[PDB]
């Protein structure tokens, strides 16, 4: 079963990216199953999208009262010492919202890390059949 765990946010990064205090020390974690358009892509650089996916993420992650994170079943952190892990603001799921909203499409998925892959892809079917911002 998988658990919540209370963080302290310091800084978000970009739609898919946040800095956070995890158990008194600075991380960077990486939303999983999510992907945003990017501000800061490796050779793009700013993608359609990619300022409203990373205000999204910044105005749902500064105005909570608590934020949490919750590792799936498999490897906890990325290649890039990156934290892979679910974000809640308030109990809200970022990254179903991010897809919701059509700001973010459902990652290539890696078993064992797929616990919420369904419940994502009805967010990202919804968001398709009402054409939001990504799919319009």
Not at 72 to 91: F, I, M, N, P, S
Request: glycine share 6%; charged share 30%.
């Amino acid at each position: 079963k998988l658990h919540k765990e209370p963080a302290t946010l310091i800084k978000a990064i970009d739609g898919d990216t946040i800095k956070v205090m995890y158990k008194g020390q600075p991380m960077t974690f990486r939303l999983l199953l999510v992907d945003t358009p990017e501000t800061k892509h490796p050779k793009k650089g700013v993608e359609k999208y990619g300022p409203e996916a990373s205000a999204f993420t910044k105005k749902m992650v500064e105005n909570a009262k608590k934020v949490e994170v919750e590792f799936d079943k498999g490897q906890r952190t990325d290649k890039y010492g990156r934290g892979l892990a679910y974000v809640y603001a308030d109990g809200k799921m970022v990254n179903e919202a991010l897809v919701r909203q059509g700001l973010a499409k459902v990652a290539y998925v890696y078993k064992p890390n797929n616990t919420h892959e369904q419940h994502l892809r009805k967010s990202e079917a919804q968001a398709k059949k009402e054409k939001l911002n990504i799919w319009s």
